[PDB]
Design a protein around this nucleic acid. Structure first.
Ligand code: MN
Ligand code: MN
Ligand code: MN
Ligand code: MN
Ligand code: MN
Ligand code: MN
Ligand code: ZN
Ligand code: ZN
Lengths: 163, 366, 366, 163
DNA sequence: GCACGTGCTAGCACGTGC
DNA sequence: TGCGAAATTCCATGACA
DNA sequence: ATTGTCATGGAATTTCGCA
DNA sequence: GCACGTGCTAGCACGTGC
DNA sequence: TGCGAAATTCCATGACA
DNA sequence: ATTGTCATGGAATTTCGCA
């Protein structure tokens, strides 16, 4: 029907455990489905607690229509259920053992998984410090299919950090 | 009695009119004038007399002249009165100015989001959750704003907040006032690492940070309204205020800051759908059409008695924090460079170079 | 869907224009308008909607309307928006006013010396000789002024000074601000014994005591000039300042206060002799000619957006000393009596009667 | 020559000792010669000290051209001499044992001497408190020779304390 | 360690209630 | 094109410092 | 070496529904 | 005795000198 | 009566709170 | 139940010395 847009649907999932970087072990990947734009929040647990905390930060900036995620514990709890309804967020789940996003997100999610593991080679002990550099990198990395960057699709402008 | 001898002989002296009879009595040379009879002291005595009548109360032009007038008369008395007033150090440094500042410049709006960040601190506030201050960061073009709760207005706390902010994007310029957390070496070294240029307001002049200062008002207003009849615990309201303001219409723009940053409303209440059937690309091209065609105001007409600065003019700086019964103005200084018709660089009283707003200067009288 | 049924049938309803096609879709009644398609909610739902869009940020008229506009349309929406804004208590008590006060009255000068005394305290100052404050007493007609050094601004110290003053003459009225030393019972009982009437400025409004407040400036100015580059020991300078000011020309009057009190200069420097050959009686008759023919200014032209008060109007008092994040305006109250076009008596929030200057009132909006 | 005026010449002299009223024993009588206007300052001594103190108060209001007085100690000291010259006051003395003022002052001085001694009958112990009442009385008391009061000749107006 | 320069809001006094 | 009502814009004021 | 701003509600003007 | 109403000016924080 | 210089008045600004 | 003021210095106007 109508064309896809930002703030239409965000995809979210957990990465970890990882090496005890500054007291944290995990990362919450957030990726907008039309822009491929990406936020990364480190956590000390794949729990419902840490999800709401991070996501409050994000949804005080903008608010998605939908969240999509696997059937991991944190997303299927009834606590996270009541959080998504307070703010008008419709929830969507994949089917067990058959992960599903889109072309665009599957690949982005992949890179994040690759770039992340790479600093887990080069600077493998203290990763907490390096996240903001990664997010910038991911949001200014050009997309093959469309002819602009996530930063470009989100703000309608060039960046001051070209990559 | 130098040339006073000539006048007594009836000769003519340029300045003193001839239709009046000038004589000698009790040793002194007088003149018969409409008001009454007046003494004409020799030119040598004249400087001393004007100083004796000024020092009565440190009176200005008119009040001084009227004193001397009771006893004396001579040509262009006021010429000699302003001569002393230009040199009497105490009057020049205590007296107030009667000249307005030139009319404000309205700087052109930053062109694209993330060109200029304006920052500033709010507080100390009633303690909430052990938090006292709020670092406030406003983007020039959009007006979009981030709020961060800190326990002090330190460079340390300012570092940690901008780090979380800059993950989204990195700005070209950050503009602050000369507050101590923002002028630290550590903070400049932080700006250098990220390639951001630091820019500073002229001191004792909040107007310059007017964009963020104005946004502080909107922030306090709504905070206040939401805490009516309830203990003042603001901490947990910051994210709610950040969101409401970011999505609220500027009536003369017809847009919200969210809209000028992203071109489309997110899943917030009462969302604009108007660009529904367009692709993203048709939206993003529209956003640039709007962004270049916003309202911008023109500088107001001058006051009938303003002044505007010039190289080599004599001006005086407003003493920052004078103690009681102490003068409110520094000694006179010279204008070196005029940066704009409201900004100026002087060789101060240290004497270093200083960059000041004309709102803390006054033209030296005489 | 009360009368919404009629409109769907094509019937006409006063207010909604007929050249537009109104339909039904997804259960809701919409309309096709230039901007796009809009929902028309039933009148029962309408109050709730305007409140949901206001409470987002407590936005005013225009910012509210634009929110609701994104989704809805109906006749005279703004009529319903201002309806809520007139009743939403938080907005009425936090919002600032956009209306100026009416233009100042310049009260007629007191006619004869000793009709009106204006008093006021200065300080605390740098301690000199163990003295901290200065009681300042200005006579209305002349401008003549007495200065007294006190160790506190108490009724006790105010008693003792006026006692030494009143030996010369006793005034009809003494006018003060509502300062605690001047409103004490002991002080009123002192005024009663001497047959003087006490008169009080409206609170939080120094303009009213403008005569003495203005004279405080002249007193600080000269004190300052005389203490430049020297420790601030003022005590022994008070009698010198009293004298210099009392004999200094008001340029628009052409007279000194000494002159308007006695009609002749004493043995002070640069004395006016002009009335030398006249008897005392020819002087004293002249003094009355001058005293009735002094300069007096006329009230200035109003602002293009001022307001002036009326009986039974809704107004709100400026909260005297609000704590942080607390509202700056009291709940609305009604004007009982209009004493002049700048002074008013209200039934406050206690509710007593109170007499306030219009500079601490604002017209309630809506 | 030219007509007499206020501030032309003040006459001054000491009265006392008296009963220890509130710690004082004397009074300094000041009387303007053309107006008959009168100031009274109590003192604890007929010394040069107390004279300058009082007179500083008075000459911060207005300043006479001349002072006249007997050859009492306080006025003939060289300390009081240097005080009168600082302020431009010319000094005049009567001849020893032959007091001289004018018609107008001789009588005024007399009343002050009489009204004073009267409260020294009626309220004979505490006179310090009663001075301001006396001064008002003396300055609003009508003069036989001229047809106005000292208050009237000084301020060119009626009084609010008629007597 | 303490004064200085730049950015901010607290606090004291008096006379009168309860 | 022209009328009265309605919608939309104009703009002084005041608070942030 | 840098620079006022913009939400707000009565007033003033523009547009709009209808014929 | 302590909070209140009316009138006033002090004072704290931060980062950097000597 | 008229001209140029000199004297005198006009009046916005800012500090007192 | 009470209410702005007035010293100040460049600008704008009035007067004045002379013929
Ligand atoms: Mn998972
Ligand atoms: Mn600041
Ligand atoms: Mn006061
Ligand atoms: Mn004697
Ligand atoms: Mn600020
Ligand atoms: Mn005062
Ligand atoms: Zn001076
Ligand atoms: Zn509201």
């Amino acid at each position: 029907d109508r064309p896809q847009k930002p703030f239409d649907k965000f995809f979210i999932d957990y990465i970890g455990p990882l090496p005890p970087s500054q007291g944290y072990l995990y990362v919450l990947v957030v990726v907008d489905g039309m822009t491929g734009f990406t936020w990364l929040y480190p956590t000390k647990a794949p729990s419902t607690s840490a999800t709401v905390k991070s996501l409050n930060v994000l949804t005080s900036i903008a608010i998605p229509k939908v969240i999509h995620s696997d059937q991991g514990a944190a997303f299927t709890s009834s606590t996270f259920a009541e959080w998504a309804k307070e703010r008008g967020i419709h929830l969507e789940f994949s089917t067990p053992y058959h992960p599903q996003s889109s072309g665009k997100v599957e690949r982005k999610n992949s890179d994040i998984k690759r770039l992340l593991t790479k600093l887990l080679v080069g600077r493998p002990t203290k990763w907490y410090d390096l996240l903001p550099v990664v997010q910038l990198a991911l949001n200014n990395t050009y997309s093959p299919v469309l002819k602009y960057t996530p930063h470009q699709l989100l703000f309608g402008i060039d960046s001051n950090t070209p990559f | 009695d130098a040339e006073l001898d000539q006048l007594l002989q009836g000769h003519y002296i340029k300045g003193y009119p001839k239709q009046y009879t000038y004589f000698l009595e009790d040793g002194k040379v007088k003149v018969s004038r409409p008001e009454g009879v007046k003494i004409i002291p020799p030119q040598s005595d004249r400087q001393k007399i004007v100083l004796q009548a000024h020092n009565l109360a440190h009176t200005g032009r008119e009040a001084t002249l009227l004193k001397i007038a009771n006893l004396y008369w001579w040509p262009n008395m006021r010429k000699d009165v302003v001569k002393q007033l230009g040199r009497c150090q105490q009057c020049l440094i205590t007296n107030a100015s009667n000249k307005a500042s030139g009319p404000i410049l309205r700087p052109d709006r930053p062109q694209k989001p993330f060109d200029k960040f304006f920052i500033d601190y709010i507080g100390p506030l009633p303690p909430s959750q052990g938090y006292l201050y709020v670092l406030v960061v406003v983007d020039g073009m959009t007006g979009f704003t981030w709020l961060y709760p800190t326990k002090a207005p330190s460079t340390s706390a300012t570092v940690k907040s901008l780090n979380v902010l800059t993950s989204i994007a990195i700005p070209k310029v950050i503009h602050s006032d000369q507050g101590a957390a923002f002028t630290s070496s550590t903070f400049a070294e932080w700006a250098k690492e990220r390639g951001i240029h630091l820019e500073f307001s002229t001191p004792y002049h909040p107007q310059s940070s007017g964009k963020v200062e104005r946004k502080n008002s909107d922030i306090k207003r709504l905070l206040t309204k939401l805490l009516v009849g309830r203990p003042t615990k603001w901490y947990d309201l910051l994210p709610v205020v950040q969101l409401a303001l970011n999505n609220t219409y500027s009536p003369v723009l017809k847009y919200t800051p969210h809209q000028l940053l992203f071109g489309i409303d997110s899943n917030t209440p009462f969302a604009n759908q108007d660009t529904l059937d367009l692709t993203r690309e048709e939206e993003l091209s529209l956003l640039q059409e709007i962004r270049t065609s916003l309202y911008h105001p023109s500088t107001p007409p001058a006051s009938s008695r303003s002044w505007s600065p010039v190289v080599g003019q004599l001006v005086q700086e407003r003493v920052a924090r004078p103690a009681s019964l102490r003068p409110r103005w520094h000694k006179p200084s010279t204008v070196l460079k005029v940066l704009n018709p409201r900004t100026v660089v002087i060789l101060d009283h240290l004497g270093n170079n200083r960059t000041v707003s004309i709102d803390n200067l006054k033209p030296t009288s005489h």
